[PDB]
Copies of this chain bind each other. A is one copy, B any other.
Amino acid sequence: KKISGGSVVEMQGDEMTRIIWELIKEKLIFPYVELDLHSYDLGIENRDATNDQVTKDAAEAIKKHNVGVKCATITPDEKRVEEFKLKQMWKSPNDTIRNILGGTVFREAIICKNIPRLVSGWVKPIIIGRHAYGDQYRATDFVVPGPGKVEITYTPSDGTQKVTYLVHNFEEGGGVAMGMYNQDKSIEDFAHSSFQMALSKGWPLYLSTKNTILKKYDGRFKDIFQEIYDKQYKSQFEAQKIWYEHRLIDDMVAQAMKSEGGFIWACKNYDGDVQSDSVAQGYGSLGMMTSVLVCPDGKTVEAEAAHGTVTRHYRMYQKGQETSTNPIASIFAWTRGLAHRAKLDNNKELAFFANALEEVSIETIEAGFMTKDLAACIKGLPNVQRSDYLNTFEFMDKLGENLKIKLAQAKLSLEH
């Protein structure tokens, strides 16, 4: 009776998103879909117990099975070490997974007709390609305890030369220092996936850098995009009446803010992290955004919610208080992962189910059933009352109700 879904790597998360994750599988996915499921618990406690090995195992599973769907996870700092009694301050599971997989994370809002934006002009989608490799997420940082010299050096593999650059000589007191890097091959994959996304969408492409400040580091990104564009993409762009343009990041954020949308924005790793949260909130909620890592092999993807574990909501959950937390981004992690699974396997029954769940989610909200974040978009936050929204479970229950109806109607249809 259930759809045969194939192999999926599932990564369990923390706090409020872990609660939603279990409700998605129980209500939305498992009743209709049977999966060969490789489950990795990335909850903070299991990562601590495995010395973060479960995270690297999960990344290797995604390479093997080509599809993974990830819940948001805690990245610990000193406060989390004290809260959970951790052995170490573990690195972000996302940093580890993206470092191993590589590629570009494409992030885009999920639009409902009845939800007012915070930014008046965006009538079309903004799609951020976020380079998923290197920079601050692979970096090496340390505290400078006192006076002394920090240098960064490059030694070729043959060991026949050494280049030493002075970072800073600390004359009095200490500070911080860090190295970071990126790679030409990853930059080229990032460029290709950006131009290909623009052509698939019929939309212009913009790349943002600081190249006036980092002339070598950011100038490399700019050069590689320009060279790949001129050689391989430019005739196809003009044929679709679109263009590619590099801008300084600050000009770019101002242009995007005042634009009508409808463009692809290639972002360096850190910029794509921050701006995608600004963009998601600007369209009205961090809970309404898709995030899909498209790996360079053209086969493997990892779908996820780009927002965090929603700690403040989890604290209320721990007290038995009602929570209204937006599940949509977490649900679209599953739908986007299953859609790609169905595409790899040419599974029409699964491809239909994935799209059906996405339509149900939008239709439910557009019919007036929503969590508190979205009711705050329509009214003001100060004007919202309990009767204006559903709690987290009521909303999942409504979605489950409407999903059963949509799948029932499909079975009764002639198309079937």
Contact = CB atoms under 8 A, between A and B. Distances in A.
B173 A150 contact: no
A398 B397 CA distance: 62
Nearest to A116: B120
So how many copies of this chain end up in the complex?
2
A364 interface: no
A256 B240 CA distance: 37
Nearest to A257: B281
A163 B220 CA distance: 29
Contact of A177 (B148, B180, B187, B210): B180
Contact of A253 (B182, B216, B277): B277
Interface in A330-355: none
A253 B276 CA distance: 10
Interface in A119-134: 119-121, 134
A397 to B, nearest CB: 27
A181 B185 contact: no
B118 A257 contact: yes
A238 interface: no
A220 B181 contact: no
B182 A176 contact: yes
Interface string A94-120: 010000000000000000000011111
28 contacts: A116-B120, A118-B257, A118-B258, A119-B119, A119-B257, A134-B175, A137-B213, A142-B154, A142-B216, A143-B220, A144-B183, A148-B157, A149-B154, A152-B177, A152-B178, A167-B181, A168-B183, A172-B185, A175-B182, A176-B220, A177-B179, A178-B180, A178-B181, A250-B273, A254-B280, A254-B286, A257-B281, A257-B282
Given A138-B168, A146-B156, A150-B152, 16 more contacts: A78-B219, A119-B119, A140-B166, A141-B216, A144-B154, A147-B156, A148-B154, A148-B158, A152-B152, A152-B167, A172-B185, A174-B183, A175-B184, A178-B216, A178-B217, A250-B274
For the complex of A and B, 9 pairs with smallest distance between CB atoms: A167-B179, A152-B179, A175-B183, A141-B217, A148-B156, A147-B157, A254-B281, A75-B212, A250-B277
